[PDB]
Design brief:
Family (chain B): Belongs to the adenoviridae hexon-interlacing protein family.
Distance between the termini of chain B: 118 Å
Order of helices and strands of chain A: HEEEE
Order of helices and strands of chain B: H
Largest sheet of chain A: 2 strands, antiparallel
Shape of chain B: rod-shaped
Oligomer: part of a larger assembly
Largest interface: A-B, 4 and 6 residues
Number of helices of chain B: 1
Strand content of chain B: under 5%
Structural class of chain B: mainly alpha
Organism (chain B): Human adenovirus D10
Shape of chain A: flat
Number of strands of chain A: 4
Protein name (chain B): Hexon-interlacing protein
Coiled coil (chain B): 29-56
Structural class of chain A: mainly beta
Subcellular location (chain B): Virion; Host nucleus
Strand order of the largest sheet of chain A: 1-4
């Protein structure tokens, strides 16, 4: 079939929940109180109080 | 001519508040969105262990 990795037909982007980044095993990025929860980039949430 | 002559001889105004009671408020709100997930999580866990009967009976 299509080969997304070669041709660009990416179709599973909706499956991510969150991503977190940590330099030197200590400094969370972007840090600095920037986002509403970015010691983790919360891509989507299943329940939203 | 005389005797009585000594003295002298709409549509919609659209109110709104009418005859109901008074009203009040408070700001301690909204745990409730969590139970909608509690309920539908635990509902799955029921079926999950019905399956664990069947998957042990089938042995």
């Amino acid at each position: 079939g299509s080969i997304p990795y070669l041709d660009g037909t990416f179709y599973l982007n909706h499956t991510f929940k969150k991503v977190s980044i940590m330099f030197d095993s200590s400094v969370s990025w972007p840090g600095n109180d920037r986002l509403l929860t970015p010691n983790e980039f919360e891509i989507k949430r299943s329940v939203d109080g | 001519a005389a005797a009585a002559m000594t003295a002298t001889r709409m549509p919609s105004s659209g109110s709104s508040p009418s005859v109901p009671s008074s009203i009040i408020a408070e700001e301690k709100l909204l745990a409730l969105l969590a139970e909608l997930e509690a309920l539908s999580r635990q509902l799955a866990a029921l079926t999950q262990q019905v399956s664990e009967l069947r998957e042990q009976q089938q042995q």
